Symmetry: D2
């Protein structure tokens, strides 16, 4: 799930993990 | 990834799919 | 994450939910 | 999606990225 070359999907996954611990 | 009994993770996955086709 | 006309990413997400539900 | 002290969900997401990168 990318906006151009930016992996939005991956970055969203990182936020889910960081928020959840 | 749930807010209480609501599966936010799952619903987010559905949005990623619906938006992307 | 597709394998041809198959949304593998989506199926994996549904599997995670099914197994954890 | 954890298996004990292991974030399986996170590792799966990273694998999808690695294989598709």
């Amino acid at each position: 799930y990318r906006i151009x070359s930016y992996d939005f999907x991956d970055e969203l996954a990182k936020l889910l993990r960081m928020a959840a611990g």
